[PDB]
Amino acid sequence: AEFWNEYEDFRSFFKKKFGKDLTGYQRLWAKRIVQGKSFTMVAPTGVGKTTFGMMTALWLARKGKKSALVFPTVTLVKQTLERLQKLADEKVKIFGFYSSMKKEEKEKFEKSFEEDDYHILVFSTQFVSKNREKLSQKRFDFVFVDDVDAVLKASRNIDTLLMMVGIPEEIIRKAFSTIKQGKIYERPKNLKPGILVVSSATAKPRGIRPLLFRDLLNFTVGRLVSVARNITHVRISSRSKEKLVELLEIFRDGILIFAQTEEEGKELYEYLKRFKFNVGETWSEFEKNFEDFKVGKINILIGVQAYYGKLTRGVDLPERIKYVIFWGTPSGPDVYTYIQASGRSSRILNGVLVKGVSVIFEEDEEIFESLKTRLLLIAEEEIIEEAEANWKELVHEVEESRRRSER
Numbered sequence: 001a002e003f004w005n006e007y008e009d010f011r012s013f014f015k016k017k018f019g020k021d022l023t024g025y026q027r028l029w030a031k032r033i034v035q036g037k038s039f040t041m042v043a044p045t046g047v048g049k050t051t052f053g054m055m056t057a058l059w060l061a062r063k064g065k066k067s068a069l070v071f072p073t074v075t076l077v078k079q080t081l082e083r084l085q086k087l088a089d090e091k092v093k094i095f096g097f098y099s100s101m102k103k104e105e106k107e108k109f110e111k112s113f114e115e116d117d118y119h120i121l122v123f124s125t126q127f128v129s130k131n132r133e134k135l136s137q138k139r140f141d142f143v144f145v146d147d148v149d150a151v152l153k154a155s156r157n158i159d160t161l162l163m164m165v166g167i168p169e170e171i172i173r174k175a176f177s178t179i180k181q182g183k184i185y186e187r188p189k190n191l192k193p194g195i196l197v198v199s200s201a202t203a204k205p206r207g208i209r210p211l212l213f214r215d216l217l218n219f220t221v222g223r224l225v226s227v228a229r230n231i232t233h234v235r236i237s238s239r240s241k242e243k244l245v246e247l248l249e250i251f252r253d254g255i256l257i258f259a260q261t262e263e264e265g266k267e268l269y270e271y272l273k274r275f276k277f278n279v280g281e282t283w284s285e286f287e288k289n290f291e292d293f294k295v296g297k298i299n300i301l302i303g304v305q306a307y308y309g310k311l312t313r314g315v316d317l318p319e320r321i322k323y324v325i326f327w328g329t330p331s332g333p334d335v336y337t338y339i340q341a342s343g344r345s346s347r348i349l350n351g352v353l354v355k356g357v358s359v360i361f362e363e364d365e366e367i368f369e370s371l372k373t374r375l376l377l378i379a380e381e382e383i384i385e386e387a388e389a390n391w392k393e394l395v396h397e398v399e400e401s402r403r404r405s406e407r
């Protein structure tokens with residue numbers, strides 16, 4: 001989904017209303033908000049964290065969207081309310097609450113809170129403790145939390161925040177139950193929760209509960225984990241069709257072969273058909289050939305390495321795609337196309353990140369070395385030499401991971 005026009009709209013609104021341009025960090029944070037992403041603000045104090053959350057709430061309000069700004073102190077509630085009411089347009093409904101407030105002001109908050117007649121609410125972590133039940137019955141497009149420790153003091157707190165962004169209690173329970181088993185929970189794609197932004201991160205994150213954020217909102221408030229898939233990358237220091245035939249003989253089924261050009265692809269297709277292999281091509285009849293591969297009629301599928309490729313990116317079958325073979329490295333080397341194509345062999349099938357095997361046939365030492373360093377930098381993955389690969393053990397890991405996915 002395209003986001004650049006929404007980002008410039010946010011960027012312009014910020015400059016006009018705040019008076020100054022978004023900072024380096026705020027630009028990064030804006031690009032996330034505009035895409036509906038949740039995140040932890042990783043930056044020091046005085047670089048515009050509160051200002052950013054305040055301006056986000058205001059921008060969302062123009063579209064009729066709802067926000068909750070949560071602070072650890074009463075003075076932060078008071079100051080944010082004051083700044084908001086001076087910055088606000090005629091249309092926007094802003095209400096705040098703290099215990100030292102006048103009975104008059106408290107009653108205006110309580111009325112509109114109950115009637116759902118607000119755009120922006122500003123309250124403390126103390127208000128959250130006293131009103132968990134009423135708050136968990138509400139959906140906000142944006143929840144900004146200044147206090148991180150308050151989020152994690154009580155496990156009940158994490159749940160309240162998750163419910164405030166439109167995640168039903170039943171899904172939190174199902175997610176938690178799966179995580180506890182040692183599995184990865186796959187959130188429902190049609191759910192569209194709101195944005196949760198936490199102001200800082202815990203140096204000491206504690207328990208299984210903060211993992212609900214990873215699986216439900218695609219972010220962590222703890223340490224930032226490696227982006228490595230469960231793939232073993234193996235390099236063959238040649239283009240031997242004989243070596244290829246011997247890998248096909250043990251891999252047998254669920255194989256994708258990516259050639260550099262359509263010309264080389266056809267050559268390879270010709271040779272494999274000659275050796276009576278059950279091979280299909282993707283250049284001429286993609287839809288028919290892919291369906292045949294999917295249902296198990298075709299064992300090997302040959303295609304062309306391309307950045308927004310039908311076979312390189314589009315295809316989503318970890319149960320069926322097990323082995324990816326590159327006939328030469330994607331021209332460049334193009335690590336981005338390499339990561340996408342090899343990624344076909346490894347993704348989540350029933351809470352388990354299944355095993356993939358990516359084999360590169362590359363004779364050019366220079367081209368291979370450039371691919372190896374780029375893959376280490378971008379994907380935190382290494383490529384191992386043919387002699388280091390135990391093919392029988394790899395086939396076993398491919399098969400065993402797909403049984404554990406079935407469980």
Ligand SMILES: [Cl-]
Pocket residue numbers: 083087
């Ligand atoms: Cl201001």
